């Protein structure tokens, strides 16, 4: 067994390789997209994780795409997150904040000025996002058609990520994870299916990866490379955003570029919750030889699969999502081979304490 052995992750050291995957729960306070004491308790309960990766958090108000998702751009948000990270640390844990811009997976009603959300191109995501009704309950709504970002607006996006990282540092986070997956803004630019731009941000893979790499350079400069992690989902289709006809080659290009920055980690979301083709060991080898930091595998992993790939030296840690929602002490359970609490999917999004902080520990 290696899941319970230490691992150097950038500027921090995880005591085990059982990580908590970033999980949107949409329980923040509105107005203000403010983290709550309940959220602090939720994270505190899971502080034994090798590393806790927070729910996706807005880098700006424009980044918002889901009612209930927290932000890390306002004073009130920073003050709230400081309490959450302090609680995790009081329990000897480590926490990274996942930062995102939802791009076209949003709705005009939650955008500043009630205007259309932005993206690489003016193409509807053709999916749904979550809003709240008059009683605060989570509801699904079709996504609003986006406006294509003007070339001169791009620097602003990079600056928003940079500022969000500066705020993350002050908020007490140990690391930050750039959300470059699952069809959100950064992925919208990376994918040819969602990017039809004819300027230097569209077309070739070099052009498509331009934005995410500018963001990476900006945040490394703002804080430190060993404080930066990034999540990608470069193989398969996610929320209607595929990865092009040369997904494997383009993925290796991106990974090689990221490696040049010497960032803390590469987090690979292998499949959509709906499933997808499994990574071949050959591909895992090509990815491993191109990145020199920690590699985190994720996507319906089993303890056995984690041990198998960590043992083969293909990955360093595993991020568990749904098992962490239902098991605050997942580490102890996996170590003791204890049974897990049953999952209650109906309370994954929105609501309150029920289905959030009421899953018992051993
Ligand atoms: C309720 C829910 C919310 C999620 N929110 C996020 C998110 O904020 N950021 C992200 O990168 N992935 C998100 N994911 C994906 C998970 O991080 C994870 O990759 C996925 O659930 C597959 O892993 P699992 O089989 O261990 O649950 C979400 C998944 C679930 C079920």
Q: How far apart are CA 345 and CA 326, in angstroms?
A: 10
Both structure tokens of 79? 């003050």
Q: How far apart are CA 300 and CA 157, in angstroms?
A: 32
- SS3 state at 361: coil
Tell the residue number behind the tokens 């490379």, with chain if given. Answer: 225
**CA–centroid distance, residue 301 to ligand 1 (Å):** 12
Max intra-chain CA distance, the chain: 56
Selected catalytic residue, list 42, 184, 324, 349: 184
**CA–centroid distance, residue 23 to ligand 1 (Å):** 5
Beta strand segments in 240-302, E: 265-269, 294-298
- SS3 state at 33: coil
Q: How far apart are CA 326 and CA 55, in angstroms?
A: 15
Both structure tokens of 338? 């204890």
Q: How far apart are CA 124 and CA 54, in angstroms?
A: 27
Element (H, E) at 192: none
* 184 included as an active-site residue: yes
Element (H, E) at 158: helix 154-170
Q: How many CA atoms lie within 13 A of 335 on its CB side?
A: 15
Q: What is the DSSP letter of 241?
A: B
Q: How far apart are CA 54 and CA 35, in angstroms?
A: 11
Q: List the resolution, Å.
A: 1.6
Whether omega before 319 lies within 30 degrees of 0, making that bond cis, reads: no
Element (H, E) at 147: strand 147-148
Pairing of strands 138-142, 18-20: unpaired
Q: 146 and 183 in contact (C-beta within 8 Å)?
A: no
**CA–centroid distance, residue 195 to ligand 1 (Å):** 24
- Residue 343: closest CA among 249, 252, 273, 264: 273
Q: How many CA atoms lie within 13 A of 217 on its CB side?
A: 8
Q: How far apart are CA 93 and CA 45, in angstroms?
A: 10
Sign of CA dihedral 325, 75, 231, 196: positive
* Tally of CB atoms within 10 A around 251: 23
Q: What CA–CA distances, in Å, run from 360 to 233, 348, 357?
A: 32, 16, 8
- SS3 state at 225: helix
DSSP codes of every residue in 96-144: EEEEE--TTSS-GGGSGGGPPPEESSS----SEEEEE-TTS-EEEEEPP
- Residue 329: is it exposed, middle or buried by C-beta count within 10 angstroms (0-12/13-18/19+)? buried
Tell the residue number behind the tokens 């470059």, with chain if given. Answer: 180
Determine which residue's CA is closest to atom 10 belonging to ligand 1.
22
Determine which residue's CA is closest to atom 19 belonging to ligand 1.
299
Domains (ranges, CATH) in the chain? Answer: 1-362 (3.20.20.70)
Q: What is the DSSP letter of 340?
A: P
Q: How far apart are CA 180 and CA 190, in angstroms?
A: 9
**CA–centroid distance, residue 274 to ligand 1 (Å):** 12
Q: How far apart are CA 175 and CA 53, in angstroms?
A: 9
* Buried-exposed string 141-161: b where 16+ CB fall within 10 A, e elsewhere: eebbebebbeeeebeebbebb
- Residue 331: closest CA among 12, 51, 9: 51
Q: How far apart are CA 22 and CA 320, in angstroms?
A: 9
- Residue 193: is it exposed, middle or buried by C-beta count within 10 angstroms (0-12/13-18/19+)? middle
* Tally of CB atoms within 10 A around 306: 22
Pairing of strands 228-232, 265-269: parallel
- Residue 362: closest CA among 333, 334, 331: 333
Is 58 a known ligand-binding residue?
no
Q: Which residues pair with 100 in a beta bridge?
A: 58
Ligand 1 pocket list (CB less than 6 A): 21-24, 55-56, 98, 179, 181-182, 231, 269, 273, 298-301, 320-323, 348
Index of the ligand 1 atom closest to the CA of residue 269: 19
Q: Which residues pair with 319 in a beta bridge?
A: 19, 298
Q: What is the DSSP letter of 29?
A: B
Determine which residue's CA is closest to atom 11 belonging to ligand 1.
22
Contacts for 204 with CB less than 8 Å, ≥ 6 apart:
none
């Amino acid at each position: 067994e290696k899941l319970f052995t230490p691992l150097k992750v950038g500027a921090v050291t995880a005591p085990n390789r059982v990580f908590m995957a970033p999980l949107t729960r949409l329980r923040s306070i509105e107005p203000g997209d403010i983290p709550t004491p309940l959220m602090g308790e939720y994270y505190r309960q899971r502080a034994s994780a090798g590393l806790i990766i927070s729910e996706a958090t807005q880098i700006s108000a424009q980044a918002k795409g889901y009612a209930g998702a927290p932000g890390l751009h306002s004073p009130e948000q920073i003050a709230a997150w400081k309490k959450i990270t302090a609680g995790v640390h009081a329990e000897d844990g480590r926490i990274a904040v996942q930062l995102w811009h939802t791009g076209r997976i949003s709705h005009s009603s939650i955008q500043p000025g009630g205007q259309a959300p932005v993206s690489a191109s003016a193409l509807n995501a053709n999916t749904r996002t979550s809003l709240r009704d008059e009683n605060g309950n989570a509801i699904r709504v079709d996504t609003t058609t986006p406006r294509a970002l003007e070339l001169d607006e791009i620097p602003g996006i990079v600056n928003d990520f940079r500022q969000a990282v500066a705020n993350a540092r002050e908020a007490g986070f140990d690391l930050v994870e750039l959300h470059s997956a699952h069809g959100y803004l950064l992925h919208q630019f990376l994918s040819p299916s969602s990017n039809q731009r004819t300027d230097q941000y569209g077309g070739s893979v070099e052009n498509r990866a331009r934005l995410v790499l500018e963001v990476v350079d900006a945040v490394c400069n703002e804080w430190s490379a060993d404080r930066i992690g990034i999540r990608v989902s470069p193989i398969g289709t996610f929320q209607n955003v595929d990865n092009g006809p040369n997904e494997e080659a383009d993925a290796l290009y991106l990974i090689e570029e990221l490696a040049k920055r010497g960032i803390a980690y590469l987090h690979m979301s292998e499949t959509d919750l709906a499933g997808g083709k499994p990574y071949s060991e050959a591909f895992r080898q090509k990815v491993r030889e191109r990145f020199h930091g920690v590699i985190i595998g994720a996507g319906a992993y089993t303890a056995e699969k984690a041990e198998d790939l960590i043992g083969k030296g293909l990955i360093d840690a595993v991020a568990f999502g749904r098992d962490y929602i239902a098991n605050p002490d997942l580490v102890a359970r996996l170590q003791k081979k204890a049974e897990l609490n049953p999952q209650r999917p109906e309370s994954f999004y929105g609501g309150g304490a029920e289905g959030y902080t009421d899953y018992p520990s051993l």
